[PDB]
Amino acid sequence: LRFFAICGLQEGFEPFAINMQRPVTTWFSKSLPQFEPVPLEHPHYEVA
Amino acid sequence: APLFAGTEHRAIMVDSMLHTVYRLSRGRSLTKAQRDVIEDCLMALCRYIRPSMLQHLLRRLVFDVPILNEFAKMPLKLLTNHYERCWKYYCLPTGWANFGVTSEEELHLTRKLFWGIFDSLAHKKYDQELYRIAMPCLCAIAGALPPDYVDASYSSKTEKNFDPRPVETLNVIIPEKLDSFINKFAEYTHEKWAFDKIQNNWSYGENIDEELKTHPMLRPYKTFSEKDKEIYRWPIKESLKAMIAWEWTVEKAREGEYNPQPPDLSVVTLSRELQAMAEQLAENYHNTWGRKKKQELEAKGGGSHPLLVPYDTLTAKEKARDREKAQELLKFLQMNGYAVTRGLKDMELDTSSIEKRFAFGFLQQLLRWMDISQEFIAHLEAVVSSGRVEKSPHEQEIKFFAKILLPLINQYFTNHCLYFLSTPAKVLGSGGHASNKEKEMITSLFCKLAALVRHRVSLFGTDAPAVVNCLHILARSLDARTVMKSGPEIVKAGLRSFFESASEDIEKMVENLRLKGVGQNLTYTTVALLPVLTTLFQHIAQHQFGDDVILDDVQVSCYRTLCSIYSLGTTRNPYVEKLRPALGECLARLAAAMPVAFLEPELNEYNACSVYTTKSPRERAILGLPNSVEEMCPDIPVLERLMAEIGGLAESGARYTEMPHVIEITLPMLCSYLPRWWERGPEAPPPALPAGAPPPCTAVTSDHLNSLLGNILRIIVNNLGIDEASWMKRLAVFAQPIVSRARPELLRSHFIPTIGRLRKRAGKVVAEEEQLRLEAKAEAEEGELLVRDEFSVLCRDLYALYPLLIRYVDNNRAHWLTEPNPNAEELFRM
Repeat sequence: residue ranges (chain B)? Predict the structure, then answer.
């Protein structure tokens, strides 16, 4: 971290993954269209 | 009322309720309490109804309010509150969050309301209540309207409980060529109505009946009876006679081009002028329709038709229903070859989108009223000087200008300041940028208002503060770079004359102070010119217009003002002592604005934004300019002479009384000067270094800024603890900008001893307070005021010094934290 000491360290803030023995897993918004069930609360579309 | 929010699913019923409540409010034989209750209910409803649903109510208010009668007062407040609440819904392009965005029809109604109220109020006689109620409404509507909104349906003529009278068609005769056209369009309409039946599955038969799906009179036009020929031709006769009464000339210059066979007119397209004639045709059709409905209302003895509102007010979709008949008639006229001409100032204007912009017309009206202001101000001055007369022919215009226009100018150019400053390259505002013509018009407005105020602050009386505030707003909203680069010679000369007159007035004030015209000049300067000029220079410096605006004659005038103020600074007098703060602030802004390093003229020949460099040697001789920049006005000492003098005074530790001129005038000037010319001098960021760059015109470096800050701190500590030092806060405020660029050594050298002295004094004073607390009764009462005054002076000193320290701490906070600093630790301790 480049600026944690300058701002954040003295204020008591702690790094998000400070004591994590493995890198944090991430999820990204894949733009591949997928078929999913129509939500039961969809604002516009209703299936009966 | 709150429950009515989000009632879109019952928009029709809500609109009917609003209409009924408005009618009840307008009703007669109603006690004042009852009317108050009705008005309160209407206002409470409109507070929570969605802005989109209030369109129909606004349509009626557009017709009703402009009359500005007694009943018009409540609608004014209603519109004021509605527009103040929903200004985003109308102004912003994205629209008010969760409420959508305004539509073209709503914006058109808003402009109609604004201009109707403006014209009615301008023509009406002065009334305090009406003028107090309307002005807020006008301000709210103007703020709601987008500055660059262009109305698609603009009429130059802008002609016009309701008058349903149509044109006297029957009175005028019909030409025989137009009668042949009448017959031809008669069978055309017959065929179109037959095509309507064939679309509806209807056919020919013996009688009209829904189950039959047949029409009796659908026989071919040849066997189409005589009576129904007249029935179908009569509307055509009325339309043609209507155009004739309109004096529009229709001539068949070009030769015209059962189972329904109607010719398709969609191929024929109406031009702008044809569409205008057809708009007026629909207007006559609704006018006759409303006349018939008025006859029905008269027969009933009461009631009002919902569609009684004027054609332009009526929404486009409602207009479209009747627009179809008129447009088809005129398209057929074109197909037959008939050409209709009347002549339109609307063509004369042409598309002219920039001129159609709302702000454009607003500024045009403001400039016209500036001219009227010049006229009646001249008359008022003439009568006041001699031959006093109480008739005051222009009393109504004076009251309008003072009460409506000035607050309107203030509010409008405070709300839409960024629209007039945004340029196509860089857009400051949310959306839209003012045109070059609009920028020129606002500059002309500012110049005209300043000229109007010149030496007439006493005449304006209690309205002088409002006029000066309007001048402040206009100067802050004034974009000068574009105006100077590409602007009419008239407006450019107007702004140059403003600057030259300001310089002349400041010279006169300086000489008068050095020692009724003198009093008038002094009061006008002190009240309007110095504040307005300070604001203008601050705006130029902030927006970097300095290099572009202050050139040539403007540079000459700025030189004069600059060193005229500096020369006044030397003189000692009570008036000078009182004026010193404002003069120093104006000087600081001028130094921040000037594009030429006046303090150091030896390196002027490198500077390109200088009068000497721009103008040829043969030039500047026609003007009264010295041959050498050094002589431009010598009194200003050189930059390094000034730096030496400030350091000498600081080391000598002279009090404020010893150098009143320095602390008040010179130090703010250097504080504004040093950062600007450092940014352009050596040690600066080199963006242009890769390209060929001449030597910097200035020699200012970070050393000068560090030394000036050190000397300022020395002066403050030397004057530390004085009974009365009001200059300390001004000096701190003026010295903030240079604080960023303080060398790390400054901490040890200056800050630690100063804060140490402050801590020592605080400790002593708290010890005195504790001793006082130990004492009681008269001993406690006595000395309480003494310790209180000591605390007050200590607080003054701390508020003078800490603002500089905070900025210094921020820049060096990161370095101090990265590398431990005992100096930082000791400063924290103190």
Answer: 161-257, 258-362
For B605, which DSSP code?
G
Round to whole Å and give the CA distance between B432 and B422.
8
Interfacial residues of A (vs B; Cβ cutoff 8 Å):
5-6, 10
Residues 6+ apart with CB under 8 A from B191: B221, B260, B261, B262, B263
Query: Residue B683 is encoded by which pair of tokens?
Result: 């040690």
B814 with A10: Cβ contact below 8 A: no
Identity at B605, one-letter amino acid code: E
Task: Report how far apart, in Å, the C-alpha atoms of B477 and of each of B471, B539, B693 are.
Answer: 10, 8, 34
Question: For residue A5, which residues of chain B lie inside 8 Å, CB to CB?
Answer: 817-818
* C-alpha to C-alpha distance for B552 and B609, rounded to whole angstroms: 9
Measured CA to CA, the distance from residue B365 to residue B718 in angstroms comes to 57
B815 touches chain A (CB under 8 A): no
Q: What is the greatest pairwise CA distance in chain A?
A: 59
Task: State the CB neighbour count (10 A cutoff) for residue B358.
Answer: 20
**What span, in angstroms and rounded, lies between the C-alpha atoms of B45 and B498?**
51
Q: Where are the alpha helices (DSSP H) in B681-783?
A: 702-718, 727-739, 745-746, 752-774, 778-781
Distance CA B539, CA B475 (A): 7
For every residue of B396-462, DSSP letters joined together read HHHHHIIIIIHHHHHHHHHHTHHHHH--SSS--SSS----HHHHHHHHHHHHHHHHHHTT-HHHHGG
Strands B203-204 and B214-215: parallel
The DSSP result for B320-371, as a single string, is HHHHHHHHHHHHHHHHTTEEEE---HHHHH-S-HHHHSHHHHHHHHHHHHHH
Q: After which residues is chain B broken (C to N over 2.5 A)?
A: 160, 257, 515
Structure tokens at B767: 């010890």
Q: Do B818 and A10 touch (CB under 8 A)?
A: no
DSSP 8-state symbol, B135: H
Write the burial class of residue B125 (CB in 10 Å: 0-12 exposed, 13-18 middle, 19+ buried).
Answer: exposed
Q: Tokens 């210094």 correspond to what residue?
A: B808
Q: Does B814 touch chain A (CB under 8 A)?
A: yes
Chain B residues closer than 8 Å to A6 by CB:
813-814, 817-818
Resolution (A): 2.9
In sequence order, the β-bridge partners of residue B252 are B338
Residue from B810, B815, B817 to probe the interface with A (highest A Cβ count within 10 Å)? B817
In angstroms, what separates the C-alpha of A35 from chain B's closest C-alpha?
A: 30
Q: Residue B552: CA atoms inside 13 Å, Cβ hemisphere, count?
A: 14
B-chain residue closest to A7, CA distance: B814
Give chain A positions within 8 Å (CB) of B813.
Answer: 6
Distance from CA of A19 to the nearest CA of B (A): 23
Residues B390, B396, B401, B407: is their CA dihedral positive or negative?
positive
Tokens read off for B355:
């001129």
Which run of H or E residues covers position B46? helix B32-48
Q: How far out from the chain centre does Cα B53 lie?
A: 28
Q: Which residues of A touch B828 (CB under 8 A)?
A: none
Q: Are strands B249-252 and B214-215 parallel, antiparallel or unpaired?
A: unpaired
Q: In B594-701, which ranges are continuous DSSP H helix?
A: 611-614, 639-652, 660-661, 667-680
Q: Are B589 and B541 in contact (CB under 8 A)?
A: yes
DSSP helix/strand/coil, B659: coil
d(CA B537, CA B775): 56
Q: Which residues of B are less than 8 Å from A10 in CB distance?
A: 817
Q: Which two tokens stand for residue B169?
A: 């068609």
Which residue, B823, B665, B673, is CA-closest to B750? B823
- Residues B636 and B598 sit within 8 Å (Cβ to Cβ): yes
Does B813 lie at the interface with A, CB-CB under 8 angstroms?
Answer: yes
The Cα–Cα gap between B433 and B447 comes to: 22
